[PDB]
Design a protein around this nucleic acid. Structure first.
Lengths: 94, 96
DNA sequence: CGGTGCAACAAATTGATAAGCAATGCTTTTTTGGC
DNA sequence: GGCCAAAAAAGCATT
DNA sequence: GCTTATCAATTTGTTGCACC
């Protein structure tokens, strides 16, 4: 399911909110989440999961294609942790 | 942290939606992603990232407190692979 | 709009096993905006 | 909403 | 080829948000 397909599925369901409105809403929510992380803030949606930033220490990496060394500075990367309801619903196994 | 309430507040201010629909749109948004995942479908949100399902076989685990070896059961889990766009926007963030 | 209670949530802990990634050009998918 | 070509993003290689 | 994440069971302290 792509972002646009998500919009269509939402649009359909509740025929009481304009399709265009749902399009704008979904795009706005994702920007809100993205900007929140870019601002260094966490995301906490009970039953879905939480997003935070994990630190990666500076290091001497490599261009894996050429083997050349490359100096990488410290940085932050997004991390997502599934909430209970999402874990359970997604886990088909016992 | 960003919460459902805050997200609804933003939809109210930015798009002028009713506080009732803003609240419902947010819940529908996350539910629709959950539904797709419980259905085994990959969710790819361009500009943000992908939520993928991985089937993990059983493996060795234990009770960290004590040490009693306990097998981590087989399970299908949800992982998130942030896209490059989001990765760039965040690489130089500063935890508040 | 606001107060409250509590299931869901963060952090800690150990160690075998699994997942993810540095650079970058080419390919493929998804989005975008006009009709 | 569909079409279509151009752009943006992602996918691949290997990541 | 090396680094980071996954997870077990259990406790302590915290919080999103449904319900009044």
């Amino acid at each position: 399911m792509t972002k646009s397909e998500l919009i269509e599925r939402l649009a359909t369901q509740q025929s009481h909110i304009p399709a265009k409105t749902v399009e704008d809403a979904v795009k706005e929510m994702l920007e809100h989440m993205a900007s929140t992380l870019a601002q260094g803030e966490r995301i906490a949606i009970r039953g879905f999961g939480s997003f935070s930033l994990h630190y990666r220490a500076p290091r001497t990496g490599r261009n894996p294609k050429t083997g050349d060394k490359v100096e990488l500075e410290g940085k932050y990367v997004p991390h997502f942790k599934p909430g209970k309801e999402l874990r359970d619903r997604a886990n088909i196994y016992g | 942290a960003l919460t459902k309430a805050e997200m609804s507040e933003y939809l109210f201010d930015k798009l002028g939606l009713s506080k009732r629909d803003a609240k419902e749109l947010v819940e529908l948004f996350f539910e629709e992603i959950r539904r797709a995942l419980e259905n085994g479908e990959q969710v790819k949100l361009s500009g943000f990232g992908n939520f993928d399902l991985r089937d993990k076989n059983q493996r060795p685990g234990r009770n960290p407190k004590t040490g009693e070896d306990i097998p981590i059961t087989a399970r299908r889990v949800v992982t998130f692979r942030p896209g490059q766009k989001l990765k760039s926007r965040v690489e130089n963030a500063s935890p508040k």
